Amino acid sequence: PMTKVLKADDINKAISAFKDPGTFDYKRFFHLVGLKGKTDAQVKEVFEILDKDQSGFIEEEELKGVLKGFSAHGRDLNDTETKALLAAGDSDHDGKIGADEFAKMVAQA
Ligand SMILES: [Ca+2]
Ligand SMILES: [Ca+2]
């Protein structure tokens, strides 16, 4: 559950900001949810909840469901929003987000 790391109200604030399709911005999202300023081990705890099938990577299918990892009231990301997350975070160009790529995205937000 994300409340092991993040405040319940910050999660709801961030879900509200992105309730409508096409609005996602990863930098604003990590600022609103309070993931900035957390330790490397807390960020990797969040990474592990988002990696639903426990493959060690957030594949595109799971990137689409990133907001639902924080709240069941969230919506799915559309394909333009999912591609923008790979454009910004997929450093080694293998088409998915690894743990240190995810930690980097949080660091640069
Ligand atoms: Ca996975
Ligand atoms: Ca990658």
Curated annotation (Swiss-Prot):
Segments forming domain EF-hand: 38-73, 77-109
Annotated residues for binding of Ca(2+) 2: D90, D92, D94, K96, E101
Species name: Triakis semifasciata (Leopard shark)
This protein's name: Parvalbumin alpha
Single Gene Ontology MF annotation: calcium ion binding
Coiled-coil stretches: none
Entries under InterPro entries matching the protein: EF-hand-dom_pair (IPR011992), EF_Hand_1_Ca_BS (IPR018247), EF_hand_dom (IPR002048), Parvalbumin (IPR008080)
GO CC, alphabetical: cytoplasm
Record: residues binding Ca(2+) 1: D51, D53, S55, E62
Disulfide cross-links: none
Family statement: Belongs to the parvalbumin family.
